[PDB]
Structures are given as C-alpha cells and as structure tokens.
Design a protein around this ligand. Structure first.
Ligand SMILES: CCn1c(-c2cc(N3CCN(C)CC3)cnc2[C@H](C)OC)c2c3cc(ccc31)-c1csc(n1)C[C@H](NC(=O)[C@H]1C[C@@H]1C)C(=O)N1CCC[C@H](N1)C(=O)OCC(C)(C)C2
Ligand SMILES: Nc1nc2c(ncn2[C@@H]2O[C@H](COP(=O)(O)OP(=O)(O)NP(=O)(O)O)[C@@H](O)[C@H]2O)c(=O)[nH]1
Ligand SMILES: [Mg+2]
Lengths: 164, 169
C-alpha cells in the first residue's frame, strides 16, 4: 500500500493548513522512500522547518532545500544526489508531485507541486506522488508567489510526517 | 541620469549570474542557483559620467528558447556569455546572436562577446577562435572571471560604451 505523508504549511509563522500526498511507491519506490523519510525526519534531517522558496502562479510551488534554505541545497537519504528512477508517470495536471533537478541524475530533496499541467517536463523530472487532500492549500500558497518565483511571505513546512 | 538596459544571455551554467552578482554585490559563491529571471540596478561612473545600469539576468535553460523574444525587444545591449571550458556554450553563442538579430530586425545591435571562467586551467575554447568570431560580428571580445573579478567591470562598461555610441547615431 502506497504511503501517505502530510505537510502542515505556515505563512510567516501562522498556520495555513495541511496538504497530504500519496507517494507512488509501487512505480517509483526509491524516489517515494526518499520523500517519505525526509518527511518523517527519521534520518536526523529532512523537510521540517524548510520553506517553499520558488512559487510561480500558474505553474508550481517548489521547495525541499533544507540544507541551505536558499534554493541551491538539499540532499537525499542516499547521498547528495541520486539517479532518475524512471519517467513512467507524467505531469498530467494540478497536484502532481515531482522531483526538481539540475539535469539528468541529480535528484536530491527539492520537489515541486504542479498547479497546472506541465507536459514539457515529462521525461526530465521524476513524478512520484500527488496531492491527496488540501490542494486548495497549494492554490492558497500561489497567492504569495511571483513571476520569477520569489515569495512575498515566508511559506514554511511547520510540521511534516507520515499518516498511518 | 541616462539609464542603460543591459541583458545578459548565454547557455546554462556559463556564469551569467555570477558575473552580474560580482558587478552588483562584489561577491562570488560557487553554488548553483539556476535562474528564472532576475533584474538589477547599479549606478557607475563611466568615462567621467554617471550612468544607471538596468541589468536583466536571463535563464540559460535550453528548453525555453522560444520565450526570449520579449526581453530581446526591450533590451538595448547584450552581453553574450560563453565559458572557456565549455565548447558547446561557445557554439551556442551564434544561436543567441542570430536570435537577437531576428527579434530586433537589425545587424547593428550593441553587443559584447564574453568568455568567462578564465581563472580555470581546463580551457577548451581557444582565445584566438573567440577573437575571430567577435571580429566577424564587429563586436568587442573580453575574457572574464566572475571568481577573480578579472574583466568584469570591463565587460559591462564596454557594453555601456557600445550603447552610448549607438544612441548618438
Ligand atoms: C522562460 C522563463 N521560464 C519559465 C516559463 C515558461 C513558460 N511557458 C509558457 C508556455 N508553455 C507551453 C511552456 C512554458 C511561461 N512562463 C515562464 C516564466 C514564468 O517566465 C519568467 C519556466 C522556467 C524554468 C526555468 C528557467 C526559466 C523559465 C528553470 C531554470 S532551473 C529550472 N527551470 C529547473 C529547476 N531546477 C532547480 O531549481 C534546481 C536547483 C534545484 C535542484 C526545477 O527542477 N524545477 C522544477 C520544475 C519547474 C522548474 N523548477 C521551474 O521553476 O519552472 C518554472 C516554469 C514557469 C514552470 C517554467
Ligand atoms: N571557476 C569559475 N566558476 C564560475 C565562474 N562563473 C560562474 N562559475 C560557477 O559556475 C556555476 C554556474 O554559474 P551561474 O552564474 O549560476 O551560471 P548561469 O549562466 O547564471 N546559469 P543559468 O543560465 O542556469 O542561470 C556556479 O557553480 C558558479 O559558481 C567563473 O568565472 N569561474
Ligand atoms: Mg543564472
């Protein structure tokens, strides 16, 4: 059974709400497991307290840099980077959860949540989950984005973990 | 005060942002922070006259080559950057120049050819080859290092001079 994780999102420290994700462990188990472990913090590091550093209304919300907190960092549970597992799943519309990267085989911890269909990313970013509950929270996070992605408030993962 | 609209273009990872941040903030860090699109402002005294530079730092991400027309219409002068250890980035230069010529519908666009990362020992682009390309375009060629600051002010200030001349035509 595919695991479920949640983010409790805050805006400048004030609660906004909870987004939950199904992780497609049946199709991308290594990529799903990295995201699951970083969400629980069980390796001693992970997403808790990190921010969404790039939000572009009409496209996506991007986050996951918990090492440098500037959009340049992040690391996986397998090392700084790991390989593209597969490109089976596509960027079909809002809610898709997919890995950010800096070219082939450079997955770390950064990820993005689509707010539209982003088909030209197919075959270049590994899709590994989707929003289950709280998509309207992600839509609400777009209110603080901009054309080049700089955010107007601090959008943070105040808490995260795995749902039973 | 006269305001010059400069645009920095070139392939991913050649150092466009590192060059711009060295000029604006006098700072270099080795981290990779690929650009969506950033804009900066700096006032400088060039040839005894104060100039205001508006600098657009553009994305090298190759998938969006059809999204460049708007900023090429707006920009007055272009810094065309390759990296001296990346031969593909030097080949990409002509692609950028053709695109700027088409969008502006002109062969006379203020432009400077910049060969960046000259601090590195692993050169794959011969300096003479780049000088010859710039001569064929009729534009200046400057070798730079965003890491050591070599040529950084020279490249941007030279582009300002090219636009200054263009404006007096
Ligand atoms: C032309 C202007 N532009 C645009 C763009 C594209 C359009 N289209 C209209 C027509 N349709 C059919 C096609 C697209 C319209 N408007 C704009 C923007 C709003 O105009 C300013 C994009 C973009 C992306 C990059 C650079 C310039 C860019 C870029 C530069 S690094 C990158 N992508 C990939 C990025 N790596 C990282 O962060 C690395 C550091 C970490 C490890 C990454 O894994 N992710 C996740 C997936 C999304 C991507 N970030 C991102 O942010 O995409 C922004 C988006 C708006 C989706 C695309
Ligand atoms: N040694 C050396 N490294 C450089 C130099 N300029 C940039 N770099 C390094 O090269 C990498 C890419 O630099 P960056 O300025 O982001 O390149 P860019 O052209 O803006 N990339 P993008 O088009 O994706 O925004 C970084 O690791 C940066 O530190 C230079 O002159 N010397
Ligand atoms: Mg850049």
């Amino acid at each position: 059974v595919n695991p479920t994780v949640f983010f409790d999102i805050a805006v400048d420290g004030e609660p906004l709400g909870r987004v939950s994700f199904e992780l497609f462990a049946d199709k991308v188990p290594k990529t799903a497991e990295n995201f699951r472990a970083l969400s629980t913090g069980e390796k001693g590091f992970g997403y808790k307290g990190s921010c969404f550093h790039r939000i572009i209304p009409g496209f996506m919300c991007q986050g996951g840099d918990f090492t440098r907190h500037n959009g340049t960092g992040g690391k996986s549970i397998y090392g700084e980077k790991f390989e593209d597992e597969n490109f089976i799943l596509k960027h079909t519309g809002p809610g898709i959860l997919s890995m950010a990267n800096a070219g082939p085989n450079t997955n770390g911890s950064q990820f993005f949540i689509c707010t539209a269909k982003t088909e030209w990313l197919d075959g270049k970013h590994v899709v590994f989950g989707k929003v289950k509950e709280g998509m309207n929270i992600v839509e609400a996070m777009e209110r603080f984005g901009s054309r080049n992605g700089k955010t107007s408030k601090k959008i943070t993962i105040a808490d995260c973990g795995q749902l039973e | 005060m006269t305001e010059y609209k400069l645009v920095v273009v070139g392939a991913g990872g050649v150092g466009k942002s590192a060059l711009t941040i060295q000029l604006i903030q006098n700072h270099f860090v080795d981290e990779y922070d690929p650009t969506i699109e950033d804009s900066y402002r700096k006032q400088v005294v060039i040839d005894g006259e104060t100039c205001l530079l508006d600098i657009l730092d553009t994305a090298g991400q190759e998938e969006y080559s059809a999204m460049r027309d708007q900023y090429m219409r707006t920009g007055e002068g272009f810094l065309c950057v390759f990296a001296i250890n990346n031969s593909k980035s030097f080949a990409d230069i002509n692609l950028y120049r053709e695109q700027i010529k088409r969008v502006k519908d002109s062969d006379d666009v203020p432009m400077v050819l910049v060969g960046n990362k000259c601090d590195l020992p692993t050169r794959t682009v011969d300096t003479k080859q780049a000088h010859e390309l710039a001569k064929s375009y009729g534009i200046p060629f400057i070798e730079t290092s965003a890491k050591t600051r070599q040529g950084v002010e020279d490249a941007f200030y030279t582009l300002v001079r090219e636009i200054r001349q263009y404006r007096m035509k």
